[PDB]
Design goal:
Chain lengths: ~190, ~60, ~240, ~200
RNA sequence: AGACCUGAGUGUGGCAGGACUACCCGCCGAACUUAAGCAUAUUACUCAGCGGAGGAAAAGAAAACAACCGUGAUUCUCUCAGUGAGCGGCGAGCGAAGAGGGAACGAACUCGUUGCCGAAUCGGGUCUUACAAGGCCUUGAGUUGUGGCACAAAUAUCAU
RNA sequence: CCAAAGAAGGUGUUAGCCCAUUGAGCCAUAAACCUGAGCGCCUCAUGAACUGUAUUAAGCGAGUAGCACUGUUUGGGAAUGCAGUGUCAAGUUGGCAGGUAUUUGUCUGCCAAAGUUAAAUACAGAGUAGGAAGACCGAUAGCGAACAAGUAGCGUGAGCGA
RNA sequence: UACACGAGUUGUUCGGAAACUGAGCACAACGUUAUAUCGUUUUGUUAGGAAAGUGAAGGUGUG
RNA sequence: GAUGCAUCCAAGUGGUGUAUAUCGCAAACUGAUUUCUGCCCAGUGCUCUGAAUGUCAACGUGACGAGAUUCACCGACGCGC
RNA sequence: AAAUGAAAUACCACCACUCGGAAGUUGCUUCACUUAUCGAAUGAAGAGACCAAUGGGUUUAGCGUAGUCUGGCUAU
RNA sequence: CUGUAAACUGAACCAACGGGAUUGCCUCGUGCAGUUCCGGGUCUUGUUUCGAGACAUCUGCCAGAUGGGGAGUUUGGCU
RNA sequence: AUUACCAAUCUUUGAACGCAAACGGCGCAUGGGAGAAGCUUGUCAUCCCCGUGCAUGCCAUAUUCUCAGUGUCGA
């Protein structure tokens, strides 16, 4: 898949963010990561402890604030246009499972981000791997760091939307069978 | 109405098949009285020949 | 009818080469790194006689380039090669009578036996007794040598193949007449099981296309088509020129 | 939703993008064994609709099937009797590759209850179906009523009898009306039904 | 110098094979015979052959029939019907279906999609009289989706 | 004598009475299977009157359906089903079925390409468990076998077989 | 050599195996097959990750 | 001349000659020496050749009809010669 | 709508043309690839790379030609 | 310039280091004791090595020829 | 005690599964139990019994039980 003529739709995933803001993008996803089955079960427990002592009609609780980290939950965050910007993984085994993700984004004008490893979108969240993280509404503690992240990333994916969809990858020959093609223009 | 959007965003990255590509090759340079002879032999029936030959000329005014 | 003796032979049941008193397959030393970027010396220690072959097989030992052993190679013996000759088979090898220096590096008009068609198959062509090839042309722009096979049919092979220098041993075997059916018995008992040859015209018209009749005659022309099915492709197969010249 | 987009990529299966994915993935498939255990299915959209949940006790295999018509097995290519049966190469096997695929996996892995299978790739030589299999004795499968049914013992080799959808294809089921008047419930149940010589007591 | 991915290795916990085969399900599959010959056909979608389950199997909840004043899963039965159907060297021969009277039948359901949820799931523990339609600890699977709920421009969905 | 004379057998010969039977019930038996639960609690969920109010997106299974070929199958005949290869959709402005092909229309039914599902139906093969019968055969018959019968014996063997 | 009854076969070293290879066979794997009970298989297997024989630090009675 | 030839197999990275390599393999015929082995290539066979020699296969191309279909054509290697 | 021979015009849908040039598909085709495929060898036992248009993008640094989310930037 | 090339002329044999670094030691000059690289040439987008190569063979299809190799069947009546 | 019924025992094999097989053969673990020479009245040397485990394939799984990969990435 380096030799062949990679179509301009699958090429999209081999032009990922650089390590410059990729760690920053993993910084947000990490601190807005979901609750780890232990702060989840003791969160909805204070939804009874301070409700059983409550008089009535007051148990109201929700997820404090996190990033949409599933896949069909992310997709709805895009279709709803409620995901402020989405992060996408470089590689997933059935590649078609996220192939269309960076294309319904500029359909709904969400800033998307193809990032270098799904194994690094898992460590931040908590799973092993993650196909795509969506970072929806955030608290004013961190509107500064992402408002730039959206800018640092659409400068790489939305600003490039025209050249992306016309971009045939691959055709990268060997160092053995293309230094040979260097030693013959040396014979010229 | 909303599923149709899903079939035009998935029809955007994916592009056209070697039929719809080779059909609009005929339909781009006359050959329309036979573009449906192509998209009938290839595409099975003849009622779905028009609904696609009519859909590639409706894809040509939208270059 | 029944299947014919020729057709009834690629089953290879009884009609299968014997090879129990044979040595291993006789072939050049494996084309490793050493026979490409240099040579390696090897001593000829034993010249045996594989039952069913007129050419002497010379047991050549080399050193194993990588382990510490002495790997032992069985090669067909070019004529003149004796026990203890210190054979060289590499790139920079000399061209004495028995060495295996590469084919595009041997001088032209030379005499080479045990040549190999593909670069590495360890010797195929010019390998029966007394047989040999003459190098005719090198094409250094193409990198392929045209050597003349011991059948007149001169072909082109790559200039990196290997080839011994000389004539295969046991030359002149085919000229001593057999004089008796018993010396043909012991020839094929080391070879496969095809002797005696019953003439298909002396067979019954169930076992062969020629057999039958009140007289022993081939009923229809012996020259059969190239395309003819097996069991019919008997006689003169696709004979393009027929009969005494 | 998430399904709508994967389902529509695969419907546009002949485009240059999907046919690139298949041209590289039909290439590793040609260097793997016939039957291959997968961790995840290649087509989660098409697997999860065919009754595949990503719980424990669910396993997915690629099975490779050689393409082209079956050749009648007659010694020497010689067939005897009426020339009805004279052909040797043009018979078609009356059982589609997907059923054969599903039945390869059954003979091999007797501890699994094959459930379904789906098309994953085909080159001009082979054809890979991912067969969705179930471990009928993983406690998860045991205590889950959506797929308890397959633990029952009438489903031991439903693949071997044409009870899977691919089998239900070549059994002429999947047409119900006047289109299967002799197919129902089977070729022989109808055959026994139409060719029994019934004898009422009082005639 | 680690995660993930793809694979291994044995440790545990299991399973499969074998028998039986009357019936049943899949594939395969003849020929003798009949046609006063015979090659289509018939025998026969049969025998043998391979495979696989059950106490029944299979089928089964309409991409069904009808053309009516409409019927309403499958199966079975009588019947339609040896057919004014039809297939057929239009020969020998072959040959169904709807409807109808019945048997049976409290027979219907659940995934995927969709929308709303998003780990409420699963498994290892543990605690309880074994309570695993529950408790409470668990990265151990799982977010590449386990599980929950709703069924239509028409309803009422949805929370205390 | 008989609610018992056929569950018609045994007994030295032809038995209602000599024997065994058989009966309408009872000590009821474990109430370890379940009959409606009469239940019994320990726990567990899930049923209603509802205050306000939303779902809206409808979409509902693709190398699938279809088509072409050629192979089979069928009463299915310008394809009944299937298979293989080539081809390969559509999206409820829909798809399939409406037994003569094609195009153009209408109408009617239905919503394939995922899944489970009792009963009625087939089978005396495991007689497994239990049996009941007969215008049947009556020892060359009836199973090959009324008996130490798939035995003795035969065959290199598959098998054959008194 | 029939029938009946009763007896009768003694192993560190003999033969065999444990323990060789030959013609050859073919379990596995792998492939193929609707299907295998098919084929490959020591002149060395397998798209192919196919194994304690040794050497060791540490553990252990006890001044 | 080995991506060979002969050949097996139901099929397969299967098998046989072949552990071989034209002093070989496969396939025929005649039948030891010696002695010669004549003429006939019309035929039917093998065999090459195919520029042009004459003609064809689906496929591909075109035009026709609303469309099933019609009428072609590419005459292409082959097959004639 | 007057007004021409062997030919009738301004609110212009468009079939009205020997040629000129590239684009774009397509066959024909050789040129070079190699990565599929193929064959062989091998216990997969030493493959190519000084070296800079060689491409990789070269986290870069600029030059035009640019396109822009309209201070991020990239594309050529 | 620009490339791996330190080897027998009728039977010899070649297989488990030199140095520098790191830690203490009889220490730091000298060293006794674990250890690391060097070399016997650093990285490879990277095929095991070649060779052919979008041609093949042959993967699958159809098609046309050929096809007693094989199969099935037939091979009238009169007299 | 006999008969009838309803928890065991259940040899060698055989799907047969440690390997083999015209071998009542051969191992590898793992206990325990004989027998003894040495040796300290008992204690385990080979030798020899008894029993379990050990086939392949597949599934699940392992408090972070070990690993491979010029697959992906990062410190
Ligand atoms: Mg003959
Ligand atoms: Mg002949
Ligand atoms: Mg495996
Ligand atoms: Mg596997
Ligand atoms: Mg695997
Ligand atoms: Mg995969
Ligand atoms: Mg798993
Ligand atoms: Mg069913
Ligand atoms: Mg019926
Ligand atoms: Mg994988
Ligand atoms: Mg792992
Ligand atoms: Mg185990
Ligand atoms: Mg088995
Ligand atoms: Mg079985
Ligand atoms: Mg007849
Ligand atoms: Mg029939
Ligand atoms: Mg049968
Ligand atoms: Mg059932
Ligand atoms: Mg009747
Ligand atoms: Mg019939
Ligand atoms: Mg009725
Ligand atoms: Mg779900
Ligand atoms: Mg009596
Ligand atoms: Mg539907
Ligand atoms: Mg028929
Ligand atoms: Mg088909
Ligand atoms: Mg359609
Ligand atoms: Mg219709
Ligand atoms: Mg129409
Ligand atoms: Mg219309
Ligand atoms: Mg259904
Ligand atoms: Mg008698
Ligand atoms: Mg006696
Ligand atoms: Mg076998
Ligand atoms: Mg005759
Ligand atoms: Mg065994
Ligand atoms: Mg388990
Ligand atoms: Mg580890
Ligand atoms: Mg790695």
């Amino acid at each position: 898949q380096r030799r062949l003529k990679v179509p301009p739709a699958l090429n999209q995933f081999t032009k990922v963010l650089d390590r410059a803001s990729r760690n920053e993008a993993l910084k947000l996803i990490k601190k807005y990561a979901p609750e780890t089955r232990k702060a989840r079960r003791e969160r909805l427990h204070k939804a009874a402890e301070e409700k059983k002592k409550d008089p009535k009609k007051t148990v109201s609780t929700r997820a404090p604030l996190a990033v949409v980290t599933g896949l069909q939950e992310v997709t709805r965050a895009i279709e709803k246009k409620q995901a402020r910007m989405v992060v996408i993984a470089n590689n997933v085994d059935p590649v078609e499972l996220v192939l269309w993700m960076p294309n319904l984004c500029r359909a709904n004008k969400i800033p998307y981000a193809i990032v270098k490893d799904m194994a690094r979108l898992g460590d931040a969240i908590g799973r092993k791997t993650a196909t795509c993280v969506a970072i929806t509404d955030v608290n004013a503690e961190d509107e500064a760091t992402l408002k730039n992240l959206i800018r640092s990333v659409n400068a790489r994916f939305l600003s490039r939307s025209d050249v992306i969809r016309r971009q045939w990858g691959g055709l990268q020959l060997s160092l053995r069978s293309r230094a040979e093609l260097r030693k013959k223009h040396a014979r010229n | 109405k909303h599923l149709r959007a899903v079939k035009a965003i998935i029809a955007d990255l994916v592009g056209l098949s070697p039929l719809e590509k080779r059909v609009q090759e005929f339909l781009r340079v006359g050959k329309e009285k036979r573009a449906l002879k192509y998209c009938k032999k290839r595409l099975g029936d003849f009622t779905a020949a028009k609904k696609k030959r009519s859909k590639m000329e409706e894809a040509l005014r939208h270059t | 009818g029944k299947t014919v003796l020729s057709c009834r032979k690629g089953n290879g049941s009884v009609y299968q080469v014997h090879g129990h008193k044979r040595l291993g397959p006789a072939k050049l030393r494996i084309l490793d790194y050493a026979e490409r970027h240099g040579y390696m010396r090897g001593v000829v220690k034993s010249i045996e006689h594989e039952a069913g072959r007129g050419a002497a097989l010379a047991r050549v030992e080399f050193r194993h380039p990588y382990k510490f052993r002495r790997v032992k190679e069985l090669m067909v013996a070019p004529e003149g090669m004796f026990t203890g000759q210190s054979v060289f088979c590499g790139q920079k090898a000399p061209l004495a009578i028995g060495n295996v220096l590469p084919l595009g590096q041997i001088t032209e008009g030379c005499i080479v036996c045990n040549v190999e068609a593909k670069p590495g198959d360890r010797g195929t062509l010019a390998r029966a007794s007394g047989d040999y090839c003459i190098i005719i042309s090198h094409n250094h722009e193409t990198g392929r040598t045209r050597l003349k096979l011991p059948s007149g049919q001169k072909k082109s092979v790559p200039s990196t193949s290997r080839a011994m220098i000389g004539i295969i041993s046991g030359g002149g075997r085919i000229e001593k007449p057999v004089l008796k059916a018993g010396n043909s018995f012991y020839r094929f008992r080391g070879k496969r099981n095809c002797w005696p040859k019953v003439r298909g015209v002396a067979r019954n018209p169930v076992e062969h296309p020629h057999g039958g009749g009140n007289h022993q005659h081939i009923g229809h022309p012996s020259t059969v088509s190239r395309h003819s099915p097996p069991g019919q492709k008997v006689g003169l197969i696709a004979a393009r020129r027929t009969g005494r010249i | 939703g998430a399904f709508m987009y994967l389902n529509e990529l695969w419907k546009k299966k002949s485009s240059d993008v999907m046919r690139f994915i298949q041209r590289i993935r039909s290439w590793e498939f040609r260097h793997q064994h016939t039957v291959v255990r997968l961790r995840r299915p290649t087509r989660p959209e098409k697997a999860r609709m065919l009754g595949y949940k990503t719980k424990q006790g669910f396993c997915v295999f690629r099975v490779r099937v050689r393409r082209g018509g079956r050749k009648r097995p007659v010694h020497k290519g010689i067939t005897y009797g009426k020339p009805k049966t004279s052909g040797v190469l043009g018979m078609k096997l009356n059982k589609n590759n997907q059923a054969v695929a599903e039945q390869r996996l059954g003979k091999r892995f007797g501890n699994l209850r094959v459930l379904n299978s789906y098309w994953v790739n085909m080159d001009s030589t082979f054809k890979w179906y991912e067969v969705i299999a179930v471990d009928p004795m993983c406690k998860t499968i045991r205590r889950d009523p959506r797929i308890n049914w397959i633990v029952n013992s009438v489903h031991k080799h439903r693949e071997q009898r044409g009870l899977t959808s691919a089998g239900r294809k070549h059994r002429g089921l999947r047409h119900k009306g006047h289109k299967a008047s002799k197919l129902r419930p089977s070729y022989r149940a109808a055959w026994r039904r139409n060719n029994r010589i019934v004898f009422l007591r009082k005639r």
